[PDB]
């Protein structure tokens, strides 16, 4: 997907307010400047130019008055998702690498990020459950039949929930961030890999 000394970056802002993102290179060079709204539901990707085949980029995040600096290592020819999340009264970021999954006739592919304090097991299919670890753990990708997933089984050490993953389309790789437990049950934010 991405070329030499190049990356694609998708910013997911899971904070309660807007965040201004400033990605910097090895010499105060602004590789990306973008403000993303709280749960901005966009399938938009930014191409970033690197100085080498591998680089540590500096992510400058602005949220309310607060400023947070996070470093994240990237590599050429790759696509990433920057998950900006709440860190108390402040915010923090995580960089998730995307695997390129060639479309499989009749199939979609899925992956989860667990923001809960308890580990999770998701029943997507007739095989093994999909494990997704507590405190921003990342699940494996699972190739699933295309279709509607209105009540996917989730379970912690002590409860079992339902998630509405909605329609999962062929030729699409999804990312689901398990945000909170409301009165209505478990909540999941849907995003699409590039």
Author numbering: 408 to 601
Paper text:
Mammals obtain nitrogen via the uptake of di- and tri-peptides in the gastrointestinal tract through the action of PepT1 and PepT2, which are members of the POT family of proton-coupled oligopeptide transporters. Functional and biophysical studies demonstrate that these domains interact with the intestinal protease trypsin, suggesting a role in clustering proteolytic activity to the site of peptide transport in eukaryotic cells.
Following extensive screening, crystals from Rattus norvegicus PepT2, residues 410–601, were also obtained. The phases were calculated from seleno-L-methionine incorporated protein using the SAD method in space group P3221. A higher-resolution structure in space group P41212 was obtained using the P3221 crystals as seeds with a single monomer in the asymmetric unit. The crystal structures revealed that in the PepT1ECD there exist two conserved salt bridge interactions stabilizing the interface between lobe 1 and lobe 2, mediated by Asp574-Lys398 and Asp476-Arg490, whereas in PepT2ECD only one equivalent salt bridge interaction is present, between Asp505 and Arg538. Guinier analysis of the scattering data in PRIMUS (Petoukhov et al., 2007) shows that PepT2ECD has a larger radius of gyration (Rg) compared with PepT1ECD, 23.1 versus 18.4 Å, which suggests an increase in particle size. Consistent with this analysis, 3D envelopes of the ECD generated using DAMMIF show that PepT1ECD forms a compact shape ∼48 Å in length whereas PepT2ECD is more elongated, approximately 61 Å in length. The larger envelope of PepT2ECD indicates that the two immunoglobulin-like domains are structurally more dynamic than the PepT1ECD, which is consistent with the loss of the second salt bridge and also the location of Asp505 on the unstructured loop connecting lobes 1 and 2. From this panel of potential ligands we observed binding only for the intestinal protease trypsin with both mouse PepT1ECD (KD 80 ± 0.8 μM) and rat PepT2ECD (KD 165 ± 0.5 μM). We identified two highly conserved charged residues, Asp550 and Glu573 in PepT1ECD and Asp576 and Glu599 in PepT2ECD, located on one face of the ECD structure.
